[PDB]
Design a protein around this ligand. Structure first.
Ligand code: MN
Ligand code: MN
Ligand code: MN
Ligand code: MN
Ligand code: NA
Ligand code: NA
Lengths: 437, 437
């Protein structure tokens, strides 16, 4: 309905509501009042400070700015003493070093100790870049705050906003960089139609060029890829979404898709038509944070996938899901049942000693020569992909992630058929099979 | 029971019987009387002339020796005019050029026109080497005639005597060369335990060395591999049989194996236990000679084998059989049924035009991105190896040998299960699956 008018409407899906802005205003006035009362040097950073934050994602970040001659333990103790005193409630989470993540008057706050520094090239972590991120962006992003939100909003409605490992999408900083680079949401989208897996966006040089991987060069530090956590597949998806948008623009690109919620009977039909084996490994969710869990689920599900390939069950795709209590590793394979008999490779006919060993083993059928080499018929211990994985998970849990493996060691189940539809996995199965609306 | 005594007993399985020797004597006296009466220059060649021939394989070869100044058509006409006049019954078969293959007093004779030549390096075909083969071997093989028979006999009882393509084993000439080289049957066997696929036996140099393939150098012509038609797998088998013989010698190595002749019920059990798909392609045998048929059956059966591999039915082995009326191509596959759905590869996400084409095709499920590339779920047209081959043989018969293909084009059948056991293939199936006695 004309791009200019669709963007206007999306601004209402994207700009946070009234009581949200003023909920942040008073948590920002309370927090100032507490820190000011204590004499701490501080700075508000992140997207709240710049009025670029998405509707629904209100977060205040405050960095404590402590003189360059403070030790690595003295800043770690003192910095958290102020975080106790300033927050309604406090805890010590870790991004790399400890930092207080709590609440003030109903609003998430992160308090972070870090060196007071003028000029970068004098920093230690991802934490010490942040004040410089903010400084670099403040003023350049003025007038363009709504563009950022439109971009964050576009990404979020399509499941690719957030650099955390559950998402492996676009961070807020990345979105603000992009807007500074291209000028607007719409120019970002138009230009991203030509991005490749080798595109280097060098923001500080005003330059796009080719290199080895997708890389957005941090204007604060030229060694840092701001898009380091963006996965290749989400880059691909973004590029394609940008092409689709410019081809037939629509408000629905800023709305989440009315989900599938199909009933067991359609799924039964679909599975029957496809003629695959569909099953899940179920086990108890380890009590670790997301950024630790999701890489483990990815590795577990990859390991089982490779086992199934190697064992000739021809896996099509796999997926994984964490619920409150359980995790699920989900698979679909082209082979529902393989023969009991298989070929085991023996030695070249020349190698007398080793042929003798190969021929010693008692078997039910006679070995044979083919293309100059011995081979023997031997028997598999499992004939379905479900039995295979029972066996693999029982024996090779050690390879399925530190905590994922240890949980599976304690308890796991293979689920197929009508039982698989009693678990909260239907949505994931549908997506994994490309089920249409 | 001691090697020396086993060899003595085998000599009775190997040296032709009494009425066989004198059946050849009188066919050799009749034939001389006919050619002598006509004034033809001739020479008896082959293993009859040297008393090296196996029990059961009585064959007289006579080569007509015509002056060096005879044309290539004048020797072809005249040479066959004498073959009509000398044989009870005559026909013109082809090894490379025409030659009369008929009978005299109940005995196969080949009459062959060829140039009368002193010194080789003045020859045209495999035919002109033969007189020189005989000349080179006559005198060197005296006293060792029984050794040759023992060797021919050992090879024949194990299915590897004959260079013709149904066998791809050891020719008579090769066996006589081997005996001259090593001196005896037993030294041939002892030394062949060390043969490799790279062994060069250079008879005229009294030398064994390494080269690129198994090669027995013709003492008459150094470019000629006397073992050219020996297959790698039969070489392998011979080597292994020679090892087994020296390890536990026995008369039974000169006897054929009391065959399996298993009944349908055991085969049903075995197939059930193995859990494979076992089937055959049946069709009418083309009316061509063996050396033409068997390479075609090998190619047809290889082509279907590769189709089944490529289509993920995981073929274990294949075999083929010609009966009087039908041929059979036999297969065993690990996959009895595959899913209807499969992954079709699309383009890299970057390639806008080609992604658009890939995404245009109407399908039942949505395509998806994985590792930077598009993929689509699509549907197979067959889900069992039997259906696959119905389809392949109906469409790609042209690739299955000139005559084999044309017959299959006219009529073929896929046979499975109880029907497969109504055909004369059981012995071949058993061997292909390594069924034990
Ligand atoms: Mn924060
Ligand atoms: Mn940075
Ligand atoms: Mn002959
Ligand atoms: Mn020769
Ligand atoms: Na196991
Ligand atoms: Na076809």
């Amino acid at each position: 309905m004309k791009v200019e008018e669709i963007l206007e409407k999306a601004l209402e899906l994207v700009i946070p509501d009234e009581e949200e802005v003023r909920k942040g205003r008073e948590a920002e006035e309370e927090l100032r009042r507490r820190l000011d009362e204590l004499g701490v040097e501080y700075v508000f950073v992140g997207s709240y400070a710049r009025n670029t934050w998405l509707k629904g994602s209100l977060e205040i970040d405050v960095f404590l700015l402590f003189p360059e001659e403070f030790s690595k333990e003295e800043l770690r103790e003192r910095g958290l003493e102020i975080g106790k005193a300033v927050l309604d409630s406090y805890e010590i989470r870790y991004a790399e070093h400890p930092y207080v993540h709590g609440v003030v008057k109903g609003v998430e706050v992160d308090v972070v100790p870090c060196y007071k520094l003028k000029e970068p090239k004098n920093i230690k972590s991802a934490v010490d870049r942040t004040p410089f991120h903010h400084k670099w962006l403040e003023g350049r992003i003025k007038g363009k705050e709504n563009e950022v939100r439109l971009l964050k909003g576009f990404l979020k409605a399509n499941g690719i906003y957030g650099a955390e490992y559950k998402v492996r999408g676009f961070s807020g900083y990345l979105c603000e960089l992009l807007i500074v680079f291209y000028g607007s949401f719409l120019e970002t989208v138009k230009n991203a139609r030509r991005w490749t897996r080798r595109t280097v966006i060098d923001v500080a040089k005003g330059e796009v060029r080719k290199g080895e991987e997708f890389f957005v060069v941090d204007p604060v530090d030229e060694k840092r890829n701001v898009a380091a956590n963006l996965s290749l597949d989400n880059l691909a998806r973004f590029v394609h979404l940008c092409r689709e948008f410019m081809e037939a623009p629509s408000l629905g690109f800023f709305k989440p898709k009315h989900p599938l919620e199909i009933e067991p009977e359609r799924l039964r039909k679909i599975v029957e038509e496809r003629g695959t084996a569909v099953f899940a490994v179920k086990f108890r969710k380890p009590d670790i944070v997301d950024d630790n869990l999701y890489p483990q689920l990815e590795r577990a599900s990859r390991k089982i996938f490779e086992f199934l390939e190697r064992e000739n069950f021809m896996p099509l795709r796999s997926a994984f899901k964490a619920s409150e209590e359980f995790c699920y590793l989900l698979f679909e394979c082209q082979i529902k049942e393989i023969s009991r008999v298989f070929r085991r490779m023996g030695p070249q006919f020349e190698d007398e000693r080793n042929v003798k060993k190969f021929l010693s083993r008692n078997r039910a059928f006679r070995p044979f020569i083919e293309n100059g080499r011995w081979w023997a018929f031997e028997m598999r211990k499992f004939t379905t992909p479900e039995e295979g994985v029972r066996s693999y998970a029982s024996t090779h849990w050690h390879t399925l992630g530190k905590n994922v493996g240890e949980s599976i060691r304690e308890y796991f189940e293979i689920i197929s058929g009508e039982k698989l539809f009693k678990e909260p996995v239907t949505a994931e199965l549908c997506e994994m099979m490309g089920v249409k609306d």
